[PDB]
């Protein structure tokens, strides 16, 4: 028996969703698929009035009478991420405009009235669409003021009519587009009409710062302005010359990690391992927190996503490089705080409201833990004031154990990489991705990209979890581990970027240079739409070096234009590396 007046409840995320999941497993668990969409349409309503979307007059005779055989079906497992849950609904209402505008505008060519025909279409033939998510709802309304707002093209597939198609095919689009678009002008110069699918959105944003310081240082020896004496040889004879390159150029920028949902192995019943192993740690009679499904979810669904908790590790390991070389200064930002809670019996269950939970005193030394804790603190502002510094928003990790805790900051050389491996050794190997994608020459490439624009880059999610006492350990080991990058030879990364600077310069000759109309006159380029495959500019980038896992795109169109202003003057970089395009001499003829 519960209490009406005296009692008072406090609840954050994890109690509200848990009460629904435990309630969902009783009856109508398959409705969770359809459920996640309708609430998205509800919170943000656009061009919607007196909606009659989802019909379910709550006739609930079965919950009175339990002992009903539970239906085993597929699970949705829809995780409403803080920012993404709104965005899903913001896309639905925006898709709803594309469906609504198709039927409302087509019959509006009558000069006198537009009620009798539009009021007649009560049938849902309109509701049937093409591409993105559309669930079994409805939208029978009586307002009819859909002429004011403009069409927002998110769906680039067939099945349109009259007004929506008129943008694409017929020349009358110049007249249509002028009506379609309000608050924006620019329509005089254009001849003919075609609508494309470019979705880069400018903010946004950023910033930061711081410081630091401490110291330390370192050584070595010195680094931080080395001079390279390149030698070119094409016949028996040879020419040789010296040049210099500096890491420290431009400041700030960095990346805002994108938000994404989490999902699981699809079946109703609970796993035996996760339940039996949850019992091994605690000794509670009934479940503290008062949640059964959410205790099993966070463990089973997300196997691993080690990308933003990781990337700072090889970043500090390649940040350590130019600092170990000569470590005169060192600075450590004020939050050196670790979210390390001491002596808590059964909070670990309720504490899963936070992103992750890692156990101490189990393949976790006093040296291994601080790496997991340095990351929680903001990146950069360590060892070297300038150079390889930038900013990243990071997750919220929390170490936990009844007894153990140790702190540390200073690392040793030839042991930082080994001690950075160890937290990967147990858990699973997803850190190689950021060691390759984010670790290699995308840092100094983005550093050189800072010249034109700044502060818009993102790929590869945020947080990860796996532990609550002990690991299963029925997989990968790596007893012997050493690669060239860990050694004091980071120029394999920096001189890789100098090569890419030529490839960004290699798009210019085919583009324009004086004989073609000068910058800010032609603008007849065809690159940069936050798309990689059929765009051309990033295809040359994706031809060999650093393909397939970055944002970049949006900053390239400006880089090609600004590079022409430098190239016409006496300014350029360096020569020759694994290139082969015509209209400009990569090799020779």
Partner 1 sequence: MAAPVLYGGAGGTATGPGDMRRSLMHEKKQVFAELRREAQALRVAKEARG
Partner 2 sequence: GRLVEGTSLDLFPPQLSSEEFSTCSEATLAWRNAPSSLGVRPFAQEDSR
Partner 3 sequence: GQSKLTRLVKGFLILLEMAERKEVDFHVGNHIHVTYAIAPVCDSYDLPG
Residues lying near partner 1 in the complex (CB under 8 A): 106-114, 116-118, 120, 162, 166, 169-170, 172, 175, 324, 410-415, 417-418, 482, 484, 486-487
367 binds, among a copy of itself, partner 3, partner 1, none (CB under 5 to 8 A by kind): a copy of itself
Scan for tokens 């020349």, then name that residue: 171
CB-based contacts of 262: which residues, under 8 Å, 6+ apart?
A: 77, 79, 81, 301, 302
d(CA 205, CA 223): 32
| Closest to partner 1 by CB, 420 or 504 | 420
- CA 59 from centre of chain: 42
Min dist CB 541 to a copy of itself, Å, is: 41
d(CA 538, CA 396): 34
Q: How many residues does the chain have?
A: 589
The binding track of 334-373 with respect to partner 3, each residue x by CB under 8 A or -, is -----------xx---------------------------
Beta bridge partners of 400: 341, 359
484 binding partner 2? (CB under 8 A): yes
Tokens of 526: 């065809």
Beta bridge partners of 198: none
Min dist CB 59 to a copy of itself, Å, is: 5
Q: Which stretch binds partner 3 (CB under 8 A): 56-64, 292-300, 413-421, 540-548?
A: 56-64
Q: Is residue 443 helix, strand or coil? A: helix
Scan for tokens 């025909």, then name that residue: 117
229 binds, among partner 1, partner 3, partner 2, none (CB under 5 to 8 A by kind): partner 2
273 binding partner 3? (CB under 8 A): no
| Closest to partner 3 by CB, 299 or 383 | 299
Tokens of 257: 């990690």
80 binds, among partner 3, a copy of itself, partner 2, none (CB under 5 to 8 A by kind): partner 3
Buried b (16+ CB within 10 A) or exposed e, 494-521: bebbbbbbbbbbbbbeebbeeeeeebee
Task: Please tell me what DSSP assigns to residue 29.
Answer: S
122 binding a copy of itself? (CB under 8 A): yes
231 binding partner 2? (CB under 8 A): yes
- CA 33 from centre of chain: 24
84 binding a copy of itself? (CB under 8 A): no
415 binding a copy of itself? (CB under 8 A): yes
119 binds, among partner 1, partner 2, a copy of itself, none (CB under 5 to 8 A by kind): a copy of itself
CB-based contacts of 171: which residues, under 8 Å, 6+ apart?
A: 192, 193
| Closest to a copy of itself by CB, 117 or 265 | 117
| Closest to partner 3 by CB, 55 or 143 | 55
Binding-residue total with a copy of itself (CB under 8 A): 25
Residue 558 is inside which H or E element, if any? helix 556-568
Tokens of 383: 């060892």
109 binding a copy of itself? (CB under 8 A): no
d(CA 107, CA 100): 12
Q: Are strands 358-359 and 399-401 parallel, antiparallel or unpaired?
A: parallel
54 binding partner 3? (CB under 8 A): yes
Q: Are strands 227-233 and 238-244 parallel, antiparallel or unpaired?
A: antiparallel
284 binding partner 3? (CB under 8 A): yes
Asked if residues 468 and 357 have their Cβ atoms less than 8 Å apart, the reply is yes
d(CA 156, CA 130): 9
143 binding partner 3? (CB under 8 A): no
| Closest to partner 1 by CB, 131 or 147 | 147
Asked if residues 561 and 519 have their Cβ atoms less than 8 Å apart, the reply is yes
Nearest-5° Cα angle at 568, 567 to 571:
45
267 binding a copy of itself? (CB under 8 A): no
436 binds, among partner 2, partner 1, a copy of itself, none (CB under 5 to 8 A by kind): none
279 binding a copy of itself? (CB under 8 A): yes
61 binding a copy of itself? (CB under 8 A): yes
Pick the binder of a copy of itself from 9, 109, 192, 283 (CB under 8 A). 283
Q: Which stretch binds partner 3 (CB under 8 A): 80-88, 170-178, 415-423, 467-475?
A: 80-88
Where do contacts with partner 3 occur on this chain (CB under 8 A)? Answer: 54-62, 64-67, 80, 82-83, 85-86, 276, 279-280, 282-286, 288, 345-346
């Amino acid at each position: 028996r519960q209490i009406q007046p005296g009692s008072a409840v406090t609840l954050n995320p994890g109690l509200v969703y848990s009460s629904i999941l435990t309630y969902a497993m009783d009856t109508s668990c398959t409705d969770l698929l359809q459920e996640a969409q309708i609430i998205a349409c509800s919170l943000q309503e656009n061009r919607y009035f007196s909606r009659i979307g989802l019909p379910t007059v709550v006739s609930l005779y079965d919950l009175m009478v339990p002992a009903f055989i539970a239906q085993n079906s597929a699970l949705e497992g829809a995780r409403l991420s803080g920012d993404l849950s709104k965005a899903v609904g913001r896309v639905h209402q925006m898709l709803g405009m594309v469906a609504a505008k198709d039927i409302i505008s087509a019959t509006h060519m009558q000069s006198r009235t537009g009620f009798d025909p539009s009021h007649g279409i009560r049938q849902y033939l309109n509701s049937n669409s093409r591409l993105v998510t559309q669930m079994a709802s409805k939208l029978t309304g009586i307002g009819l003021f859909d002429a004011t707002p403009q069409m927002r093209i998110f769906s680039e597939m067939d099945t349109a009519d009259y007004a929506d198609m008129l943008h694409l095919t017929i020349f009358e689009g110049l007249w249509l587009v002028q009506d379609a678009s309000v608050c924006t002008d620019n329509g005089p110069i254009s001849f003919l009409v075609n609508g494309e699918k470019l979705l880069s959105a400018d903010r946004a944003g950023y910033d930061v710062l711081v410081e630091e310081l401490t110291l330390a240082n370192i050584r070595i020896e010195h680094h931080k302005m080395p001079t390279g004496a390149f030698t070119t040889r094409w016949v028996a004879a040879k020419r040789d010359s010296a040049l210099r390159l500096t890491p420290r150029s431009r400041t700030a920028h960095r990346v805002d990690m994108v938000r994404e949902c989490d999902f699981n192995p699809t079946m109703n019943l609970k796993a035996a391992g996760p339940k039996a192993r949850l019992r091994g740690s605690g000794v509670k009679s009934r479940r503290r927190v008062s949640e059964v499904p959410l205790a099993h979810v966070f463990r089973s669904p997300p196997r691993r996503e080690s990308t933003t908790t990781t990337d700072d590790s090889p970043r500090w390991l390649t940040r350590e490089g130019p600092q170990l070389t000569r470590r005169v200064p060192i600075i450590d930002e004020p939050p050196a705080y670790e979210s390390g809670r001491s002596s808590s019996p059964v909070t670990s269950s309720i504490s899963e409201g936070t992103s992750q939970h890692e156990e101490e005193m189990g393949l976790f030394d006093a040296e291994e833990l601080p790496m997991q804790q340095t990351v929680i603190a903001t990146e950069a502002r360590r060892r070297l004031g300038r150079g390889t510094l930038e900013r990243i928003q990071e997750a919220a990790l929390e170490g936990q154990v009844a007894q153990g805790e140790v702190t540390a900051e200073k690392n040793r050389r030839i042991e930082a990489m080994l001690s950075a491996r160890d937290p990967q050794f147990t858990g699973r190997e997803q850190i190689t991705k950021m060691l390759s994608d984010g670790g290699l020459g995308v840092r100094e490439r983005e550093e050189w990209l800072e010249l034109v624009d700044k502060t818009v880059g993102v790929k590869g999610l945020k947080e990860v979890r796996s532990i609550d006492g002990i690991r299963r350990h029925l997989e990968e080991y790596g007893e012997r581990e050493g690669f060239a990058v860990v050694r004091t030879l980071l120029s394999g990364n920096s001189k890789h970027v100098r090569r890419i600077n030529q490839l960004i310069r290699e798009s210019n000759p085919s583009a324009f240079e004086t004989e073609a109309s000068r910058m800010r006159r032609l603008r007849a380029d065809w690159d940069g739409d936050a798309g990689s495959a059929p765009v051309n500019a990033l295809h040359f980038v994706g031809n060999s070096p650093g393909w397939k896992r970055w944002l970049e795109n949006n900053n390239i169109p400006s880089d090609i234009q600004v590079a022409g202003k430098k190239r016409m003057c006496s300014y350029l970089a360096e020569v020759l590396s694994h290139g082969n395009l015509k209209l400009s001499d990569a090799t020779k003829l």
